[PDB]
Nucleic acid binder design. Sequence first.
RNA 1: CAAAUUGUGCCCAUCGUUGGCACGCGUGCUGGAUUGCU
DNA 2: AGCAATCCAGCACGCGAA
Length: 928
Amino acid sequence: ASETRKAYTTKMIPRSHDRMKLLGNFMDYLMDGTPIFFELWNQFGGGIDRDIISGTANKDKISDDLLLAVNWFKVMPINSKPQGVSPSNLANLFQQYSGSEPDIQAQEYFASNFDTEKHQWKDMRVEYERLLAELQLSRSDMHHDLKLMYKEKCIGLSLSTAHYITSVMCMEKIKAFLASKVGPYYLGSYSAMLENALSPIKGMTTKNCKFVLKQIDAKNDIKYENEPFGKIVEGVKWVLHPHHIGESNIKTLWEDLNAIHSKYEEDIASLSEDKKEKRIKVYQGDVCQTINTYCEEVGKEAKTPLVQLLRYLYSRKDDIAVDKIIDGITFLSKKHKVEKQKINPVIQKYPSFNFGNNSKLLGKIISPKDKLKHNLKCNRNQVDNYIWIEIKVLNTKTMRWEKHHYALSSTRFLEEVYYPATSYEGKPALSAEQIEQIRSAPVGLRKVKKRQMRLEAARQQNLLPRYTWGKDFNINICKRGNNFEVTLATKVKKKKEKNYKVVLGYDANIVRKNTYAAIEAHANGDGVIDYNDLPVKPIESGFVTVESQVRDKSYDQLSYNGVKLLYCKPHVESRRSFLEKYNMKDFEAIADDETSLYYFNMKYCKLLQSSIRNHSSQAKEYREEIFELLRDGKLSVLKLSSLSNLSFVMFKVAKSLIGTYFGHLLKKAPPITDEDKQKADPEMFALRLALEEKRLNKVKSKKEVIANKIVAKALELRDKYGPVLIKGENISDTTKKGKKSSTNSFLMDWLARGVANKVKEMVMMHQGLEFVEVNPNFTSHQDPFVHKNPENTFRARYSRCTPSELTEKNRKEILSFLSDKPSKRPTNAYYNEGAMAFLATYGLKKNDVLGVSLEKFKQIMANILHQRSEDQLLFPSRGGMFYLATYKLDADATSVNWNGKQFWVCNADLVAAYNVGLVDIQKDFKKK
RNA sequence: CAAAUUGUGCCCAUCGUUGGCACGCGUGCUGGAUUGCU
DNA sequence: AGCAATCCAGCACGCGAA
């Protein structure tokens, strides 16, 4: 029985200066009262002590010491009342409190790093005594009241809802103090302030409790018997990480070094004579060169191992073994990581004041039916583009409540649930008058006017479905400055069902046109593959393409990648003519009439970045170009950009260009603060902010649109077959230090988990759908519907191509794959066996195939493709599409007989999507 | 309780043919990544 | 090393009722 919430981010319309100021005063009164509740509950939590929690004592694994520590020892900003405690003196302070010494959990909690510059530990027990003294209440009575609170779940862990706390709760003195500090007791305002004060309290408390649990569990996984070895290895300063020595290649490096050392030792033992020092120096130089070459080789696929660390380890080769060295270094890295995990501070939340109907600040959108009643009782057009919400505002001047009306202007909200049926869908056909009105609106209001008129026409034509209002919408009024941002939240109920019938996987690639693929559960037709025991059938499989209808064409935002420059010729010609004045194969290599516009823009950004690096002293002179390249120009990043990964790469290189521009314009040593660069060129900083906001909007739109396409396909399959299952990838632990910096940057824009969260949220809104995450391990190579049934297949990937388009790089890669060399990667073995199968298919005589004269090889391939009546030839490729699948899983796959199997050349992405599906289908369907 | 001029936005070589399209908002802290000159 | 920013993700609660 799952549920979620929707929100339409309405916009407040000023009703009148007096009413607006009244609402602002009410908001300020509520906001200023929240910190009082925050401090009061800080004191209450500080008051906790043993003999109070020793009642029900209900808790999973939380030790009483950890609970007490969190209840009276928290990290808060330096500038706050409870100041006066240092980290060192935590153990004795806890010992004094409750009369017991710290335990492991409490010691770890106290032994938790934080940011001393901004935050600091706070006693949270002198605050309780301060509350007792200032309000002069007996400690016994306060203890009784707070024990009652805890018995009511009003303090500690797992607090009850704020409204319940306020309703349930020496009460006279507490209420008098609240009245002195906060306004008169009113349930709504008190509940709102208590909620907005407790939120950070309980949130950070639970987060830090689970953080301590994780830290103790991680430390229990630390061996600690390498601690002397850790100190030996550790003997400016930085932590040592496993990637600094080639975590896995260090064993081979040390084996080679041990062999060389054995040779050196046996040669020194014999041939005992002078000049030994020269040979030893020659031995040291050779080992140093070997270490450097090893680091150079290892730095091609990961971070380059540190040369100095390896030299230090090799010098101490007799005092520690290779496995001991690895254990010590991993122990040091793990200890450093565990000891830098900050504890979560407790900052004060900015109140939001959720206005509702049941138990919140009373308020409501009036109704559509009551809106019609109001428009009929009072002469009105009966149709308007605004929503009136009645809010029970507390008058600051006269301390009494009063209901006022305020206007919201969200067209989407009207389109979705508000506008009435007086008389996912499409759009109606407008009349003459409505079209004239749309054409008469100003340029900036044309789109919203068009939407409003289309909605009005839909109402006129009975094309607006009845929306069963229900009146269960929550209003969230947040006052930041002098303006409001009402939201109009709403609940959505799903009642999820487990009896699925389809599995709709999607690979969510980065740069290879993320695709989807569906699989039936109990198919009964021509093709029913018995995977293990469940009859399944490939339903279909296609790419996630979003259609933007230009005047006559239809572009794909996710993959358009820009125009091909065949129509942007004047811009490129002007840029070339201007640049010719100052001194070009690279320029022409990117200016082809088939090159995409965004690729050209990215390459130009990188070229300008390099030039500015070269011409560091004159970075300002190019600033105009940057503007003409990013905002002002018609062919600019802000004016023209798609959602394809190439576009995000272009934006990232633009941000890097701005960064290097600031660095070169502000270099002659105090740090270059953002303020200094802003003052040096406020226009450039404003442009950078504009790019950042544009990219944030760009990424949110991409997540939204991809989620829309996949969820719409899921809905289609549900309409056809039944409850669908998406099974999206669990892209976790990505962007590791072990990977190269370029790889980390490339994976950052993956947005795989963002898309997964968005589609999960959407699926929470549609009945029947559900989204689960499965392990992406080996999902990119398994052959669909045949892997795992007899056993794992793990076939390799190819790339079909004609002989005429064969390149030297392809031949070199193929020959390298043909090289029978031992490799630890299972992918290398898979590609080796695939290449062996390819050779056996046509008998290329690998020994005779690795010769020169690539033209001769092309001629031989053409002869082979002539003997066998085909069109192209396949060849293994590590980054190639066209995975070999046994079934026709594409609908465009080509049947080809490889050996005796009659495979279907599908596309790698579609088979990957299929693999992502049915990974744990048995878990989905139990025999019950 | 009347402003009837804007929810956030997204797409484009010819910004309109009424162009096409999407969307949970906030707050808070915690982990990985973007230049720069030795 | 002789130090300025920001983005991508991860969890904590409001969006109870009777």
